[PDB]
Amino acid sequence: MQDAITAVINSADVQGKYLDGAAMDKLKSYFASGELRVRAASVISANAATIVKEAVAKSLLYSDVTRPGGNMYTTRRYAACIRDLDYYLRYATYAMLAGDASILDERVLNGLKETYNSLGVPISSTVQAIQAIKEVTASLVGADAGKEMGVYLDYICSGLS
């Protein structure tokens, strides 16, 4: 994976360059955002389970997905799905802290579409669940942090497209 600092480091290294003014400026901008990122990460970590619970209640419960024949039917499948929502929330928090989507490219979206297609998991339903997670997380962490976390959750969603 590659965060803002590491992205700057890579850009400088591949030119054999020491960090110039612009690179230090990018580092300083990331430092300025760091406080907000840490605050949002703390709040989400404290409330990941309830964020997932509310997202599920919003998007999945009391629909054909949880009824007999639906992909969330049976306890094993329901547990797997809420586990997946835990995955997406945790990795979106990781990306928000890093300020970079590369972790999502490396260990979230790689082969995910094939995984769900082979399992038969419905793509549209999980996209709507991730949208619900974005909305609940925004309502918990405020407009700005919700915008950033939404950037990364929407990155995941676009990956599933």
Binding site: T6, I9, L19, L27, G34, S42, R90, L97, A98
Partner: protein, 160 residues
Amino acid sequence: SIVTKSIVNADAEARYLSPGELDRIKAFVTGGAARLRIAETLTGSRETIVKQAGDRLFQKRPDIVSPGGNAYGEEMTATCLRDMDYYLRLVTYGVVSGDVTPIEEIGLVGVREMYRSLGTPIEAVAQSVREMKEVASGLMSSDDAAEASAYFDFVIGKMS
């Protein structure tokens, strides 16, 4: 960087970053000005740092610049100073990132194989990094000298 290392540690355990890890990231990000200043001081004195460290190297190991040595002649000596420049630049990278991973990925994984292929005594490179460390610590305060010396010692210890 500190952020990526903390994330990798937490993800290996399938958990969010702990409060202690978050506090460490917060402290790093708040103290950023000092580390950027340290990187700027190392970068500005790069020519003199490399030059004086190389002088001390060729004084402590004249053999490498004696005939039959890896750094014999102006070309090989020049390339040795160029390598010292690489390792100083990686030191700055590790300082600003607050983690040794840039240094390690760029210049330590498989370094033994490279310098064994090139016939370069790896111990002499470690000693050159020691010389650069001393010269660098002579160009900054004690606190930031220690801050840089952590990563300098990282390079030395990995190359020995």
